[PDB]
Design a protein around this ligand. Structure first.
Ligand code: RPW
Lengths: 826, 248, 327
């Protein structure tokens, strides 16, 4: 068996959702910000936000909504986790003591159901009579909000429309009514139903079905003064309400897809709209009052306000202040002005909240020679793309290098006192027949620049037609100084060439240090690329020189230096190249039993290969023969998102289900089959999507640091900005910390009353297994934050093994010291 | 695709056994003894008639490719029965076949199994499988005797007498190389033909074509009387050579 | 000739890698040196010398040389390790069962979650499975181990049945005790849970109906670790075993012993409301508790869902691409 320990070094920073209301008091205006597994509670002031409380939940926050049922003084909070843990939460404060109350809870998972494409949707009735959930295709789940439903029991209503895009409860209806957009073979449609708690079924809805835009994405529920709903698409915005129909199709929104909306004026007069290019719009409802005294919607207008970060959630707070929740870039507070500035913008940034963004790749480098190590991360996407240099100093110090284009990979080249970074920018087919970039960025603002002139694929004769307005990716290799972080050189790759891998190394007997890039020729027609390049560059005297190019019949997904040779993965094939005295790559040997060799890692003459789905493989290079030998493979099929070698026997992998697992050689030589079988000895649901594993640590090493129980150090970056660390334990230390976890879980009160053991259970749509081989260090490190009565309750009847006393009793002071040492690994 | 498992009578003059100096009579006796050894061992173990026949067919085919002087028949027979049990889903443990083989064989005969009887048998499985070219599925005259008899209608007692007498002839033909000369469908017809002659029955009357004097042509196409007579002659030769007489 | 199996050496194949851990040996991918065709090699080891050549392999060699069908896998030949020379007793070399290499197995596609099945794709899939099962059942052979892993498919969309290790012939006229609990628990029919021992070909049908639902839900329908727990889950959806729905249930050894918590009513149509009507009816018939009332393979092929499916339009499934690998 294997024993490992996982802790968070940086909590998730990306904003997954945000709401406003009156949660902490019926008097204050609250802002609740949801980060993966984290809930942040703020109070709105005239300058900004006052933090009041933050809690963690044992689950990914999928739904987050505030509501106030009749009889309550203040808003209650509904949260549903991605594993279908539901709860209703209440804020309670006793002087200086703040705690969160679980008013109702339960798991609403159905035994039989198909998870929907557009994900979990949760909405609440305007009269707070019920919670509507869209969890599975063809089913609508209703949790009625009666006083007695403390377990959140619910029933399903058959829904004929299998493919639902979005649904909202409508305002101004005689009965609870849902309005939703759905897709069937005839296009997309908007339709209404009435929800009857008494009959437990749908009844005919207030207004008829209307055919809508093919890419109708969002449903805005208009308040009582107007009533009805607004449907946002790619080209048009439409209003629907019985006999009333409006449609505005302003050309400005066709340029970029709109992803988020919010209501500025409670009466529905003004809504805000944001798009993927970061633009912020105001949607205006132009009222017309008739002599009858009734108020009708006259027309719709869209006005461009300015630019924000690409926002997952917008929420208008008060006055001119808007909170911009960004998952791909840094979040913000911005102020909307009535008068535009001299550039024509009504939006001026107030504050910027650090978001490590999607961490596509990262490396650890000791820039200052300090023995510490600093983490340079490829963070963000599109305009929010950045290089973030992170050091420990008690908070983490983070520097931001704006790139304004997506950074794909990073690798450090000490000889050149610079970094190599792969990046891609979006250009659009313009009237010239070429393409034009939407904004300047790192690859266009380089001091010196170059473009590949390779003739490898020039024979073409394969037609690829271009339509004006279509997007393309343009890939570059950036040379970036390690001190100034100034772009020194940008090399642009071939048209339709995507850069997938980057290394910096010396090969063979060649004393030169090269940047080597693996690419793939991507054409929309091809499911899998059939062409690609391995390119050897040399960065010398401010210029990048193409040294050699090797044509391959596939995508070079991953490369890694192997004892003076170049190990590259081209589609199914894993290949080892030698570097000749003529400065050309020469194939030595190949391995082919892989569906798609996405990831590669090396230790000695051993190679760890990560298939997309047949898990991890332990290859070995056999120098006497000049070829590869399969050592052992993980036969349970699991998707791989990133792999790493822990030691000669243990191997770490990440699943796309937010699950981590450790594989080990079965170490039983009786049969060849046992050795060839890799046993998953560690299973652990992390809750994050790991993209990059990297050996290294951020802690300062003065050589005086006490040797921690933990041995080894693997850092990993995630899509939500979370940075974690994996390290190994001895059997004795694992058992102590595991037994302590079981004791802590009985003592510590969970938000929503979610069982910790359930949360960490390895879970896929198909399977759920109890965690094994992993210590939730974030649970262990919480021992230091529980009250003294609780600490002593935990240590009762706790025994150590193999100590000075074989069975040694633990005291609350003893464990405080142990955990405090464990907090020093990050 | 599939192998040919049928030879001409004339070809049996050139088996490995014959060419190593064994005369036709000795190979004939050696085949009867091995087949009957398979039959008796498996009957003691309670084995289905198909399982006995399958082992015997493996046995006969084996010595078309090998000599009796280099492969002891009783070891081969035990191995064929051991494999037949697994093929026909009537499995037996090799130790139990040895136990029964020892009970039935004298000391001189069991000397073939050498110092370790089980090992000699289990080792041979490799050669047997390769020799029979991994063509394990075998059809036997029994299923056709019943398939064809079911299409006869008439006196219940005369047809049952026909079947049992023919069934006995099938059991007796397992000691001969008829398995190596004619498909089982033909064997089943030949034994119906033989019993009819002996019981003085006219089978055509029991068929759906009572005026079709060559009654078998509706069951087995392209079979001349020449063949059915050759088979009948070979079966009755066994009885004449032995003290035993036709069952009747 | 092509028919003289057991003699050709495994030297004729370039071994590519390890694709599976089987039952009587490991299974490797390989390329034929002469033709370039890709084949999958199942290793058979008789070196144990406990009971010799595994019967599981014998069943596969016996049955698959009889069965010819597009939806049933083909054993191309049997090859051997370099045999010792003139010393069979010393020879302990292994034998290999050569099979056509099928690109993927269902579970790997489902476990990765990368595969998306349209209604039409499911129609083609189930029809090929049912047609292959009907062929086998018409030949009076029972698979007895229907599992997602055992259903191999090529990127072209052709489906072939594979693990015949536990397969046995069935005779309606002669009922004898058979290996109990042959099928894996998740796909095991209720009769095997109750220990019939004289099971009908309908056992395979039940498993295939479980696959039908799993294709629509992308999650296995009846997942449990204990036999009684499986009965409860089946009982909740399909209804509790009761004499009215299963007149002969009282004759089953464990009927009184194994009982669901309640006498649950049948809820299949309610819980699978999202499944198209034509398919839902097939599931209700395929997942029928009484084996005597459970539909046949031919009846599944003459269903509104599958009858008018045309095999010419194989319609390949939606298999992952590089863009799908990228996030
Ligand atoms: C851990 C790992 C890595 C690579 C492949 C695997 N197994 C895999 N097999 C396949 C295909 C397959 O079973 N084809 C067959 N054709 C003939 C047979 C008798 S079986 C796809 S993925 N496991």
């Amino acid at each position: 068996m294997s024993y490992n320990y996982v802790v968070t070094a940086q909590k998730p920073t990306a904003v997954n959702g945000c709401v406003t209301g009156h949660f902490t008091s019926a008097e204050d205006l609250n802002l609740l910000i949801a980060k993966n597994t984290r809930l942040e509670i703020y109070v709105v002031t005239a300058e900004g936000l006052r933090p009041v409380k933050e809690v963690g939940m044992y689950g990914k926050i999928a739904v987050m909504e505030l509501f106030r049922p009749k009889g309550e003084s203040k808003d209650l909070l509904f949260i549903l986790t991605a594993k279908y843990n539901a709860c209703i939460l209440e804020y309670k404060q006793s002087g200086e003591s703040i705690d969160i109350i679980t008013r109702a809870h339960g798991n609403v998972q159905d035994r039989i159901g198909r998870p929907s494409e557009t994900g979990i949707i949760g909405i609440i009735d305007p009269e707070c009579r019920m919670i509507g959930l869209r969890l599975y295709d063809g089913l609508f789940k209703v949790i009625p909000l009666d006083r007695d439903n403390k377990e959140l029991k619910a029933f399903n209503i058959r829904l004929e429309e299998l493919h639902v895009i979005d649904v909202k409860f409508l305002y101004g209806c005689q009965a609870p009514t849902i309005c939703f957009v759905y897709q069937d073979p005839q296009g997309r449609h908007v339709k209404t139903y009435e929800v009857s708690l008494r009959e437990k079924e749908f009844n005919k809805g207030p207004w008829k079905q209307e055919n809508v835009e093919a890419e109708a994405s969002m449903v805005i529920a208009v308040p009582e003064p107007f009533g009805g709903a607004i449907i946002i698409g790619q080209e048009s915005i439409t209003y629907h309400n019985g006999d009333k129909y409006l449609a505005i199709a302003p050309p400005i929104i066709k340029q970029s897809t709109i992803v988020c909306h919010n209501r500025v004026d409670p009466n529905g007069s003004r809504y805000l709209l944001g798009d993927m290019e970061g633009r912020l719009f105001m949607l205006l409802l132009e009222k017309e009052e008739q002599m009858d005294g009734t108020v009708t919607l006259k027309d719709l207008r869209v006005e461009l306000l300015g630019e924000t970060s690409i926002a997952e959630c917008l929420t208008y707070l008060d006055n001119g202040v808007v909170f911009v929740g960004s998952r791909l870039g840094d979040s913000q507070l911005v102020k909307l002005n009535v008068d535009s500035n001299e550039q024509g913008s009504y939006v001026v940034a107030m504050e910027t909240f650090t978001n490590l963004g999607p961490i596509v790749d990262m490396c650890v480098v000791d820039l200052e020679r300090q023995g510490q190590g600093q983490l340079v991360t490829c963070s963000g996407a599109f305009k929010e793309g950045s290089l973030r240099i992170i050091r420990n100093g008690q908070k983490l110090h983070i520097r931001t290098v704006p790139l304004y284009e997506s950074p794909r990979k990073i690798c450090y080249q000490e000889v050149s006192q610079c970094f190599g970074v792969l990046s891609s920018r979006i250009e659009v087919q313009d009237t010239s027949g070429g393409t034009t970039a939407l904004r300047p960025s790192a690859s266009t603002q380089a001091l010196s620049s170059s473009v590949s002139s390779s003739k490898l694929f020039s024979s073409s004769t394969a037609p690829h037609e271009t339509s004006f307005g279509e997007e393309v990716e343009v890939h570059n290799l950036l040379i970036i100084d390690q001190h100034t972080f100034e772009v020194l050189h940008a090399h642009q790759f071939l048209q339709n060439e995507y850069a997938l891998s980057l290394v910096s190394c010396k090969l063979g007997k060649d004393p030169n240090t090269y940047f080597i890039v693996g690419t793939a020729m991507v054409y929309p027609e091809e499911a899998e690329p059939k062409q690609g390049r391995i390119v050897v560059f040399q960065y010398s005297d401010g210029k990048l020189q193409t040294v050699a190019e090797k044509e391959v019949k596939g995508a070079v997904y991953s490369m890694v230096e192997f004892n003076g040779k170049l190990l590259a993965s081209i589609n199914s094939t894993v290949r080892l190249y030698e570097w000749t005295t003529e400065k050309e790559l020469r194939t030595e040997c190949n391995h082919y039993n892989n569906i798609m060799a996405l990831y590669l890692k090396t230790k000695g003459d051993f190679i760890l290969v990560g298939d997309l789905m047949r898990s991890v493989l332990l290859l070995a290079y056999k120098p006497m023969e000049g070829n590869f030998e399969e050592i052992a493979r993980d036969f349970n099929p699991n998707w791989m998102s990133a792999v790493e070698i822990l030691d000669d026997d243990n191997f770490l992998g990440a699943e796309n289900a937010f699950n981590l697992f450790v594989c080990q050689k079965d170490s039983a030589a009786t049969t060849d089959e046992e050795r060839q079988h890799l046993q998953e000895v560690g299973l652990f649901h992390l809750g994050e999507f790991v993209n990059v594993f990297c050996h290294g640590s951020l802690v300062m090493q003065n050589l005086g640091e006490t040797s921690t129980p933990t041995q080894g150090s693997v850092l990993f970056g995630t899509v939500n900005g979370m940075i974690g660390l994996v390290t190994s334990l001895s059997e004795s230390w694992y058992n102590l910390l595991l037994d302590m976890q079981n004791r802590l879980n009985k003592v510590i009160k969970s938000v929503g009353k979610i069982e910790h053991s359930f949360w960490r259970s390895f879970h896929t749509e198909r399977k759920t297994e109890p965690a094994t081989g992993f210590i939730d260090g974030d649970l262990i490190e919480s021992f230091l934050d529980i009250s003294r009565p609780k600490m002593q309750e935990v240590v009762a009847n706790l025994q150590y093994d193999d100590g000075s006393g074989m069975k040694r009793e633990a005291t609350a002071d003893d464990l405080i010291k142990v955990v405090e040492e464990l907090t020093r690994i990050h | 695709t599939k192998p040919c498992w049928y030879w001409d009578k004339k070809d049996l003059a050139h088996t490995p056994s014959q060419l190593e100096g064994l005369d036709p009579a000795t190979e004939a006796r050696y085949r009867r003894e091995g087949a009957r050894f398979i039959f008796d061992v498996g009957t003691r173990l309670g084995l289905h008639y198909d399982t006995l026949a399958t082992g015997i067919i493996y046995f006969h085919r084996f010595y078309m490719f090998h000599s009796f002087k280099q492969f002891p028949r009783y070891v081969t027979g035990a191995c064929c029965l051991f494999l037949a049990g697994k093929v026909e889903e009537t499995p037996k443990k090799c130790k139990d076949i040895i136990k029964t083989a020892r009970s039935l064989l004298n000391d001189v005969q069991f000397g073939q199994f050498g110092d370790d009887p089980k090992e000699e048998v289990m080792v041979l499985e490799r050669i047997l499988l390769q020799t029979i070219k991994f063509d394990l599925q075998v059809e036997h005259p029994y299923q056709f005797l019943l398939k064809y008899a079911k299409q006869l209608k008439g006196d219940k007692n005369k047809i049952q007498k026909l079947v049992q007498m023919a069934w006995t002839f099938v059991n007796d033909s397992l000691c001969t190389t008829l398995s190596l000369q004619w498909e089982p469908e033909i064997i089943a017809v030949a034994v119906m033909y033989l019993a009819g002659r002996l019981c003085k029955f006219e089978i055509q009357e029991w068929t759906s074509k009572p005026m079709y004097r060559r009654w078998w042509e509706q069951f087995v196409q392209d079979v001349p009387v020449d063949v059915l007579e050759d088979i009948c002659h070979q079966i009755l030769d066994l009885y004449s050579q032995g003290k035993q007489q036709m069952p009747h | 000739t092509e028919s003289d199996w057991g003699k050709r050496c495994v030297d004729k194949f370039d071994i590519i890698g390890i694709i599976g851990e089987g039952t009587y040996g490991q299974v490797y991918k390989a390329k034929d040196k002469d033709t370039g065709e890709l084949v999958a090699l199942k290793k058979v080891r008789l070196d144990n010398e406990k009971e010799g050549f595994p019967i599981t392999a014998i069943r596969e060699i016996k049955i698959l040389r009889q069965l010819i069908h597009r939806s049933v896998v083909n054993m191309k030949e049997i090859v051997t390790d370099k045999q010792d020379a003139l010393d069979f007793k010393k020879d302990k070399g292994a034998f290999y069962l050569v099979f056509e290499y099928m690109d993927h197995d269902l579970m790997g596609l489902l476990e990765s979650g990368l595969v998306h099945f349209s209604e039409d794709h499911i129609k083609s899939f189930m029809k090929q499975l049912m047609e292959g099962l009907e062929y086998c059942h018409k030949k009076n052979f029972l698979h007895r181990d229907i599992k997602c892993s055992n259903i191999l498919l090529n990127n072209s969309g052709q489906i072939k049945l594979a693990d015949f290790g536990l397969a046995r012939l069935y005779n309606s006229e002669e009922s004898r005790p058979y290996t109990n609990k042959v099928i894996t628990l998740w796909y095991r029919p209720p009769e095997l849970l109750l220990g019939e021992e004289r099971y009908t070909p309908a056992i395979d049908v039940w498993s295939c109906g479980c696959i039908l639902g799993e294709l629509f839900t992308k999650k296995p329908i009846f997942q449990a670790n204990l036999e009684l727990a499986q009965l409860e889950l089946i009982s909740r959806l399909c209804g509790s075993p009761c004499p009215a729905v299963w007149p002969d249930v009282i004759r089953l050894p464990y009927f009184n012993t194994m009982k669901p918590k309640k006498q649950y009513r049948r809820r299949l149509r309610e819980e699978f409301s999202f499944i198209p009507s034509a398919a839902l009816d097939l599931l209700d018939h395929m997942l029928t508790l009484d084996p005597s009332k459970r539909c046949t393979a031919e009846q599944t092929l003459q269903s509104d869902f599958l009858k008018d499916v045309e095999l010419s339009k194989m319609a390949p499934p939606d298999l992952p691409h590089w863009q799908d690998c990228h996030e």
